[PDB]
Write a protein that binds this ligand. Structure first.
Ligand code: MET
Ligand SMILES: [Zn+2]
Ligand SMILES: [Zn+2]
Length: 349
């Protein structure tokens, strides 16, 4: 690697590095899905190399647009983007401060990253719809160090507790216990770190970032169990605020409802936009910048139409109260028959 060389060109035999393998808190069965695990690994390796590169240049002074474009450019090159066979699984989240998730700049956003900002870089790659969903928090001021450590620890605790037959509610209880064991001091004020209760991890399906099961990050959830063969995004969020998020700011993220089938549309602009979405994203999430890049314009009303029709769903930024600070750490795990693989694990986090 120079990053510019596609992951597949770095591993000629098409065999990609495994992530961290763990015994749980069939070998034939495991091997029968090797092509699947392999695709996840190719996407995870791209994820590892992209984030390593990002960590080397992300600095206050850069615009959020500059950051996302530079990251996405690298991701496209390393994943060897190929329509729906290989590409970006979802938009680059770079949510700031009290905003925890689902913020990526739309065209014209002049927001500049600041020294005191706490930025959640949450981005995804896929090979054949096998998605790697993984994220980390970026800071420049050491005052947030303990908050970051709390969340990193909570995420690692959820990863450790996960396993075949494990009750999702137990994973959430564990995460909360660790998260809340931390106390931090920021600008002369102290806080007990709180998990964002209405935010959660979730199962992953083919071309489906949210397959239907959720991994709570607080006690009180469902006793539904994790199952052999499932794939999960284990993410946790810690906050100095209310520990609850609400929709806020302009929406940038959108995604077709996985269950909606074919819908004949005669309105020309709306029909065309749906065609563009089906061709380029299918059921994968996208953002407005990605429509712009494809040369689309005057699409906002068509997009609203699709949302109002329930064909597409909006995913607006999720933020805690003004003045609060939020952090995130996330990994994708495979519940293979023989072991638990933290496929996106790196030497970084
Ligand atoms: C709504 S697409 C962005 C999804 C995000 N990466 C998540 O972890 O849930
Ligand atoms: Zn994510
Ligand atoms: Zn996720």
């Amino acid at each position: 690697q120079t990053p510019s060389v596609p992951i597949c060109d770095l591993y000629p035999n098409g065999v990609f590095p495994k992530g961290q393998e763990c015994e749980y808190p069939k070998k034939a069965l495991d091997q029968a899905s090797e092509e699947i695990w392999n695709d996840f690994r190719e996407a995870a390796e791209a994820h590892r190399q992209v984030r390593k590169y990002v960590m080397s240049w992300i600095k206050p002074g850069m615009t959020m647009i500059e950051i996302c474009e530079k990251l996405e450019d690298c991701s496209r090159k390393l994943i060897k983007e190929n329509g729906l066979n290989a590409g970006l699984a979802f938009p680059t989240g770079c949510s700031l401060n009290n905003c925890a998730a689902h913020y990526t700049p739309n065209a014209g956003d002049t927001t500049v990253l600041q020294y005191d900002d706490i930025c959640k870089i949450d981005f995804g790659t896929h090979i054949s719809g096998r998605i790697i969903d993984c994220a980390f928090t970026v800071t420049f001021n050491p005052k947030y160090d303990t908050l970051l450590k709390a969340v990193k620890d909570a995420t690692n605790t959820g990863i450790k507790c996960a396993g075949i037959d494990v009750r999702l509610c137990d994973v959430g209880e564990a995460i909360q216990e660790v998260m809340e064991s931390y106390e931090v001091e920021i600008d002369g004020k102290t806080y007990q770190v709180k998990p964002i209760r209405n935010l959660n991890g979730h199962s992953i399906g083919q071309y489906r970032i949210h397959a239907g099961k959720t991994v709570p990050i607080i006690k009180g959830g469902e006793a539904t169990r994790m199952e052999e063969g499932e794939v999960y995004a284990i993410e946790t969020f810690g906050s100095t605020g209310k520990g609850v998020v609400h929709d806020d700011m302009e929406c940038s993220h959108y995604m077709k409802n996985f269950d909606v089938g074919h819908v004949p549309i005669r309105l020309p602009r709306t029909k065309h936009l749906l065609n563009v979405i089906n061709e380029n994203f299918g059921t994968l999430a996208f953002c407005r910048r990605w429509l712009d890049r494809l040369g689309e314009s005057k699409y906002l009303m068509a997009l609203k139409n699709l949302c109002d029709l329930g064909i597409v769903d909006p995913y607006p930024p999720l933020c805690d109260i003004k003045g609060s600070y939020t952090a995130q750490f996330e990994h994708t795990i495979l519940l293979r028959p023989t072991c638990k693989e933290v496929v996106s694990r790196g030497d970084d986090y």
